[PDB]
Design a protein around this ligand. Structure first.
Ligand SMILES: [Mg+2]
Lengths: 524, 525, 525
């Protein structure tokens, strides 16, 4: 179709205007004195929320160019939330700040490519300063504290997470499920987790978490690319009987097969979800068998001459529950016999001895860690179903935060960490004046979050920001109590991973937009 | 789709304008000299009403932003009516008053978050003053009085409610049905009520009450999530043959199953209604058995390996009637044998003795109270079908009012209780000046109801309000007779729960709107 | 959908404008020198009429608010014609007069609620004065006279009505049918009448009378609520084949069932009409059996386990004709055997002796009076089919008038009675000045009919009205001859019931509109 093309300043202003609508809408929720955004549903009453992620999802602009701007930031900003479980709003506010001053510079005559390099240099330096500022989170006491803070000052949640990580380890797999009663429960069952998400967002049945949950499902393991639904009929019919869901783990599911599964599942004829098999090549084949042993199913490999038509319900494995999000799949409580699993673990351990390559050994060590490690299951208990679902949510969110804290520690929150690191990089310079401007653009942008928080509180941002720079370390401003002091001590903190990711992603898109000269889109 | 986004004052003014249309439309009905609102019907002659709930339901604005404003207040204002069975109009009037003055403050430069905190502080204080002002409602004489006042001065209704609560108790289950003749009747039968509503508003067969009524139905008790319709075909066909309705009480009914039941029931092939099982976890399993013992049915537990395909009519329980609304389900007159029920009641109290914690005992005591407590059935009688339906409505309304009165008591009506509480909170302060303004915004807003009532009567609100503040206690202005005195004595009162709910919900939305900076909605296209 | 909301004066003026279009269109036909209204029918040549009811039915306005006004008056005004068989036009003219002056007062600053109270007080007083002015109508001579006057001075009709009422009594059921020839006939057959009308105005096949007539129809008796058409399939596919209509007498017919019957009947696939069963509760069940015994049908009671699917033609009762209007249903000449009916009559008479209550006896005595009383059938004869249909209409019209005359007597016509009563209530006062105005508004409005009649004649209304007030009793102005005198003697009169109903209904709607502050309707979109 005919396209509308824009260039230079004309394009960049449109791009900016779009980013402002997005940022301006989300940054009102930032801070403890965050404001409400009203999202219309036109079926029932409007939604009132302080969740910047919810707001972002709704933002789409009529102007095609302005929209492109908002959609570029949204995409990248969401990755920050996918990595650390927080920081999408922060990333958006940072992006705005960098782009605004960035474009001002470009208009002044600065070279866009140099500006970008200057920004990136300021960020790499800022990340290194974050590491130095970071406070470790290792002992269980600390883990419980971070969990409590992330759970809205609930000591219970902090304890649960601490106990869970003490059972499966810090790199261990932890899941959260509904409680059967009032008392909380913690068990370690046979399970595994691999880095593969849903092949279609239409499999999502739990929109709140944005994940797919399957209760007592069958698991199909095929070492083949499924493109047609013809070969699935015999298996789908067998699953349609006994009325249980189906998880398809194949090399890939595409074309008709995917489409049919997407439709049939949304119609509610047969609940089905599909994900790619973990890894690639030889490793993929081996891990499919791990899942088979674990779920007590058989892998349908066409390599040995097996066909999907002759796949019976006995060939399918099964587990108690399966959770699938955009990136990960978790199999919980496989029916696989203890003898079979311990048998394959010992088999792989034998392969570790025969390993010639270091790489080969590391990959095997990873697979045994999964099979032997198992999965921790936290059943959240409460007195009411409403209280139970609510607490469950806080546990899941606090879990992600605590995990991130264990990886890279914690730094002062309330946007202090960013303004702190920026203050330490005053003498940072680049190869030319344009790069120097890029650095200053980034350093000034790192004040955006704090300033915004202070603004929402109704205080003078410039004064607070000025005072915070005066201090050192994790000294900052507690926007909630209006008192200055050690942010970590006052309980206002963020996982260093969050702040890091937010900044890096923010700078990523900001850098791309600053170096854009042409935009192509459809006509109105 | 592309969205229209507004910010700051631009958004808040739009939001306000929408709230004014809603409020200005409903507040004309407030008071004993309230005016009529004419609601147009797509087909037929228009409706003339003084019911602010009926008016509110119809309010929808063309402007997307203004509409969002009206819909936010409607939603929250409705919850006051769901809690106490009255106060939707009051909550709307309050909301308007708080938002109006609240936004004026925001524009003046006040911090919205402080304004909200100041309002909330004034409300929490106002609620405490309401409790103090409240007059308890315990003795049957009082219950009859409140029931009479709520029934438009009909002593008959007051007596009926009093007698009913004297049989099943104050926390007992009371239901109302159509009369068979002129004589009113009251009977207590084997029954139970649990906090679970319909799973689809398309099961509603009685749109008037907005509930589902099933006559002599079968009850299916399955401890499983039904998602497919394949597994009930055998049961549905067996129920299609006895030509009787079916109540499905399962862990949950969703997907195709729900859809098919929604369609088939609206087509009239088989009358069916579905609700979730009460509670969750282990307690859910136990209560499903309580229903089973009561209805004389058997629970189809997949845990022990039972299937729904092998479910016969003998496995289904049955009662005389089932009433299901958005929140509650009531089973009336179960076929369960007296020996079976009394047997399980004794079993549970055995469990009360073996109970280690207090929580476990309280929860078991709750289940025995349901099984043994039974259900009171009030058949409203009259000389004409029209008069019978009319009186039935007054009994149902007066019942909800009386219940609310037994919970938190009664306070002066006519909007006096609010203006009274407000006058006692003149010295209330907050942490800063902004919060202090928030407090004054709330205190001035609590005069809105009275002022509006007086206005509808054609008298000077500022004079009446000024006189009422001069007095103490439940001293106020009877808008009907235009005389001052004790409102309780004059018979102008409201359940303390009503006034409280109305205020708290009104302040809830008002606080949210005052602290709104952004609104997102679709384009006029 | 988005709504358009108006308030206060803006709403009331819209309402008024709509009432004016209605009133101004119908009031041109009022009086003996009434004018013609030309109604377009879109299929053929236009209709020319002086029937204000026909005109009103056609009135629908483009402006949604104006329309609401006209539709409110139409609704209430029609009830006057349903009660006394006349007075819709009068009620409309009165309504206009009250609303016009009423709103003028509201705009002046008068309190709407007081204005309404003042009006109502003036009306109750006016009705009492009407009773005093009323002249009884008891003896057959008087009945014949009133019938003659109502039949446009046809002594024949007067005699027919007199003879008919002499057979079945004054409170007896009288029906009118087409004649077989020139000679008129009068017979008493097995029949009954109960106070239940059509469930949908789309069943009407005789738009002239606004009723439903079914010839040699089958009658379905079910003591259940029919909501689905599925259960009707077997019975319906047995009526169309028979080539006969179907009358459904059930507890109620609603939802799909009603809709399907409304459509199918208008398509002409199967002629069907539905009405509710008489009474409620236990009494309803008993009366449904009375109809069964009378029509020679069997009741399908689900209580004993009968289903509507297993209903055969043998289960259905049948009569020679059925007449259904908005309020009443009349079964004429049932096929029920004399032995069966006389058997149940004696059975009920036995229950009268065992009756403990007075109320119970009175209700049973009503049941027997219907079954034993029967129905009088008047076959109107003439020399031509045209003359026959024409006379039949006058007989039906004169019948309704005469019945109303027997109930409350007759008063001066030509709008004299109203202006007479008004002149006697000059000293009537209220509690305050606002109510006093309301009274004067009503008294001045009672001159509207006369003045309009005089206007249509081309005379000065103010002069005539002034002269009529000068006299006393039933002294008035015969607009036809332009002579003053005793209106009753000159043969210009109206059943007291008509004038009463017209005034009361007129004041009812007027009172509601005067107390309206808000109107809600859809947008022009
Ligand atoms: Mg007539």
């Amino acid at each position: 179709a005919a396209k509308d093309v824009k260039f230079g300043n004309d394009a960049r202003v449109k791009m900016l205007r779009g980013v402002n609508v997005l940022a301006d809408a989300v940054k009102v929720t930032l801070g403890p004195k965050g404001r409400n955004v009203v999202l219309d549903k036109s079926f029932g009453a409007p939604t009132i929320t302080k969740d910047g992620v919810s707001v972002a999802r709704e933002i789409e602009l009529e102007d095609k160019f302005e929209n492109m701007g908002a959609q570029m930031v949204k995409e990248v900003a969401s990755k920050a939330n996918d990595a650390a479980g927080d920081g999408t709003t922060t990333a958006t506010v940072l992006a705005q700040a960098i782009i605004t001053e960035g474009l001002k510079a470009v208009a002044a005559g600065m070279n866009p490519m140099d500006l970008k390099r200057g920004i990136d240099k300021a960020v790499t330096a800022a990340v290194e300063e974050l590491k130095a500022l970071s406070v470790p989170c290792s002992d269980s006491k600390a883990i419980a504290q971070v969990g409590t803070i992330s759970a809205n000052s609930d000591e219970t949640v902090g304890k649960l997470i601490a106990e869970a990580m003490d059972k499966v380890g810090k790199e261990g797999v932890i899941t959260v499920e509904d409680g059967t009663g009032l008392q909380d429960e913690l068990d370690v069952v046979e399970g595994m987790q691999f880095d593969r998400g849903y092949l279609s967002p239409y499999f999502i049945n739990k929109p709140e978490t944005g994940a797919v949950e399957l209760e007592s499902p069958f698991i199909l393991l095929a070492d083949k690319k499924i493109s047609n639904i013809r070969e699935m009929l015999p298996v789908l019919e067998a699953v349609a009987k006994a009325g249980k869901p189906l998880l398809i783990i194949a090399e890939d599911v595409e074309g008709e097969a995917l489409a049919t599964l997407v439709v049939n599942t949304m119609r509610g004829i047969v609940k089905v979800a599909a994900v790619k098999a973990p890894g690639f090549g030889d490793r993929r084949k081996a891990m499919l068998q791990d899942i088979a042993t674990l779920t007590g199913g058989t892998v349908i490999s066409e390599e040995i001459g097996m066909e999907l038509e002759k796949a019976t319900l006995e060939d399918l494995g099964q587990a108690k529950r399966v959770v699938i999000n955009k990136d990960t799949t978790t199999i919980i409580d496989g029916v696989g016999e203890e003898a079979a699993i311990q048998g394959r673990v010992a088999q792989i351990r034998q392969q570790i001895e025969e390993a010639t390559s270091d790489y080969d050994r590391e990959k095997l060590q990873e697979r045994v860690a999964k099979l032997a490690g198992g999965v921790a299951v936290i059943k959240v208990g409460a007195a009411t179903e409403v209280e139970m679902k609510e607490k469950k949510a806080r546990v899941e969110d606090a879990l992600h935060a605590t995990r991130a804290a264990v990886e890279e520690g914690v730094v002062a929150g309330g946007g202090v960490a960013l303004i702190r690191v920026a203050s330490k990089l005053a003498d940072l310079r680049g190869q030319n004046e344009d790069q120097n401007v890029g650095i200053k653009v980034a350093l000034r942008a790192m004040e955006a979050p704090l300033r915004q928080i202070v603004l929402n509180c109704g205080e003078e941002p410039s004064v607070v920001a000025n005072t915070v720079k005066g201090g050192d370390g994790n000294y900052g401003y507690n926007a909630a109590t209006e008192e200055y002091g050690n942010m970590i001590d006052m309980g206002i903190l963020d996982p260093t991973k969050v702040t890091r990711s937010a900044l890096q992603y923010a700078a990523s898109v900001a850098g791309l937009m600053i170096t854009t000269e042409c935009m192509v889109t459809d006509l109105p």
